[PDB]
Design a protein around this ligand. Structure first.
Ligand SMILES: O=c1[nH]c(=O)n([C@@H]2C[C@H](O)[C@@H](COP(=O)(O)O)O2)cc1F
Ligand SMILES: O=c1[nH]c(=O)n([C@@H]2C[C@H](O)[C@@H](COP(=O)(O)O)O2)cc1F
Lengths: 316, 316
């Protein structure tokens, strides 16, 4: 089927998976060096073997595609993937206007204490983030993220570069450029970074008709993160192809360390009792063009027939 | 054999190779999205099917490994791979102390005129480069090259970062870091660049014993450049492993556009009538350690039994 690539990685790190101690502490099953290719003309690579949200994907891709580092857009898009992160600037609070949030996670795996306080405290944070321009200014704003790396590279000699777009206009004027890369790995920055970008670089290609993409993703969580990553960059492949007046071809996913967590083995195995179902279709709106201006319903994903969601633990 | 990977790419771009018009004008056969893996414990991946110089490789790797942008080291190492490049600052000469060198190449494919003048003019340039500190200062110095990208990242807020070494000390203190990457793709710089780095990024890995490397190489010339690239990064894999007190494992080569030139087809085919020969051995000196201090004979490549060199045209 179109997603069997990912079930071949799921089986491979289970089979040839080496244990390597990881950061987010369970211990993991690693591989190093892996490419996977998806023909985006046969379907949209959301996973039919498990329910992956096309909605939350969507809202975070648009956030990136605008230049936003701010939590408020995503918050008012019911999207919480980067939420726990505005909260780093909440928790270290010289403006601590209150209580136990001192280490939030970890014991938020532990039912009352850091657990459900932190959890009612998300609305406390997620309220001023969304309703208080001032708050939103300061604690809801993730400095370097995907968004400003792809769109506002803090240049050396006082300024900013928009790699995506600058690249989009080379995808429109000089097609066969071997030089259509957008990097998120800036040397200067990476010494001080809570998450340094797991999706380091990618590169566009157009070959007789088609917009292909390749991803260099270095730390890839096979259960929980790779499913999404295939879909947020097949999406981009489509978004950009449709700006440039191109047809689509393939999405190439290259991993550095692609790893299973020890506490997601039983589940990935659970997923692997299911057979795929025919992949989705992606129809974007034909009138809208500046991909920068796209909004939520300029992308529908039709025909998503998925097995239920399987539910993790965490990767922390 | 250990190099059959590269003969499988050589056959693949010949077979599935799509024509794509290229920059360096013949026209080319492209693929996009390709990984190749070499087990550096079975051998050193220099190509027995054709004579690839281990010597010139060597001298340019050391140049990189020090921090040098200057042409003079390589010049006094009989190494001319980056020579035609000091000569960009010769040819645009406000200090033109002389004659026809006005467009050097192209008609240097054409026998007297730009041809053998330019060619006697290399000693003219390659003399002051090597004997005239002042000259060497200015026209022999390739600003951003591999060397200062890997070792002296011109930081934003007035300074420099040494990604390689800073990474080497994380390969020594925190081994399982998924974060051991050195990039050569700096956004700021790439707008103005005659060659923007074809070997964009790479990443180190240590898995139960071994130093693995992966390369993200975007524009790869399968006949003329890939043979080398395998060997200059297997070398690095070894150089770094031997600083850190590790054994070696694999070198992963990922390509973006891996392309044949139209005028190298007959030759790559010529190479493919030959069968491999057992790969080399690489013995570095056991006393020297700071890989930064290594010199020419702290690396011998034993047992190189290669078929003759096959001889190109150019890729320009
Ligand atoms: O977009 C992402 N995709 C992904 O797969 N991870 C993984 C999950 C894992 O828990 C985290 C930590 O990796 P490292 O220790 O290399 O930072 O990287 C994180 C992201 F932000
Ligand atoms: O280290 C290198 N390796 C390599 O394979 N090339 C290729 C050869 C080709 O002629 C050149 C031009 O590519 P682009 O048009 O993408 O600059 O890239 C160039 C290097 F510098």
């Amino acid at each position: 089927m179109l997603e069997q690539p990912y079930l071949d990685l799921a089986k491979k790190v289970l089979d040839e998976g080496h244990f390597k101690p990881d950061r987010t502490h369970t211990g993991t099953y690693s591989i190093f060096g892996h490419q996977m290719r998806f023909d985006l003309s046969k379907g949209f690579p959301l996973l039919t073997t498990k329910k992956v949200p096309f909605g939350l994907i969507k809202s975070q891709l648009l956030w990136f595609l605008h230049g936003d580092t701010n939590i408020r857009f995503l918050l008012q898009h019911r999207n919480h993937i980067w939420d726990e992160w505005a909260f780093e600037k909440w928790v270290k609070s010289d403006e601590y206007h209150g209580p136990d949030m001192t280490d939030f996670g970890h014991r938020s795996q532990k039912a009352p204490e850091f657990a459900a306080v932190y959890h009612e405290e998300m609305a406390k944070f997620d309220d001023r983030v969304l309703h208080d321009d001032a708050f939103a200014a300061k604690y809801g704003d993730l400095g370097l993220v995907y968004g400003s790396q792809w769109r506002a590279w803090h240049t050396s000699k006082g300024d900013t570069i928009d790699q995506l777009g600058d690249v989009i206009e080379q995808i429109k004027t000089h097609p066969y450029s071997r030089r259509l890369i957008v990097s998120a790995w800036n040397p200067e920055d990476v010494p001080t970074m809570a998450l340094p970008p797991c999706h380091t670089l990618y590169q566009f290609y157009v070959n007789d008709g088609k917009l292909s993409l390749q991803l260099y993703q270095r730390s890839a969580d096979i259960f929980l993160g790779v499913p999404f990553n295939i879909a947020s960059y097949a999406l981009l492949t489509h978004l950009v192809a449709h700006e440039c007046g191109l047809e689509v071809g393939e999405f190439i996913h290259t991993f550095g360390d692609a790893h299973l967590y020890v506490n997601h083995l039983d589940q990935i195995k659970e997923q692997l009792s299911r057979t795929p179902r025919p992949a989705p279709t992606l129809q974007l709106n034909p009138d809208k063009h500046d991909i920068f201006d796209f909004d939520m319903k300029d992308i529908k994903l039709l025909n998503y027939d998925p097995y239920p969601a399987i539910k993790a633990p965490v990767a922390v």
